[PDB]
Amino acid sequence: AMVPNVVVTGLTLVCSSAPGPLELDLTGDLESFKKQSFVLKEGVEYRIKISFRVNREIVSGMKYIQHTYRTGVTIDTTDYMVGSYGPRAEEYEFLTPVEEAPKGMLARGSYSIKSRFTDDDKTDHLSWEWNLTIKKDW
Ligand SMILES: [Li+]
């Protein structure tokens, strides 16, 4: 040890009607994501895919927690059970159940997202922040 047990390397929004790839490289500087955004068409169904390595010892109780913030005054949190993953060379990919982008004129515009990849022991495997913008059209 010192070497980290879990290395989170990517986030991908999985949506077949998105015209281009929607991906964050989580291995580098994380600050630049704060002023970027992914556009999603209102009401579209998508999933979030987290890519990650496990290095040393099995990790069980893994969990993906996402807080969604809207205009600094409204918050919604979802916590997803990820599973138990043995150490191994090859990357893993977790995908959430299907979610639906916010729908309605009043639901358009910007949302901030606080993502945390953690476990039963509250290890901060990676925390990060990114943004969605909900639009009428792609
Ligand atoms: Li938090």
Q: Which residue has the tokens 């982008």?
A: 101
> Ligand 1 centroid vs 94 CA: distance in angstroms?
21
Domain residues for 82? 1-138
Residues 126-131: contacts with CB under 8 Å, at least 24 apart: 126/6, 126/8, 126/26, 128/11, 128/24, 128/26, 128/30, 128/33, 129/30, 129/33, 129/34, 130/11, 130/24, 130/33, 130/34, 130/36, 130/37, 130/38, 131/33, 131/34, 131/36, 131/37, 131/38
- Here the CATH number for the domain that contains residue 127 is 2.70.50.30
At 33, list the tokens.
């994501």
**Rounded to whole angstroms, how far apart are CA atoms 44 and 128?**
24
Q: Which residues pair with 111 in a beta bridge?
A: 132
**Rounded to whole angstroms, how far apart are CA atoms 66 and 77?**
6
Provide the number of structural domains found in the chain.
Answer: 1
> Ligand 1 centroid vs 127 CA: distance in angstroms?
9
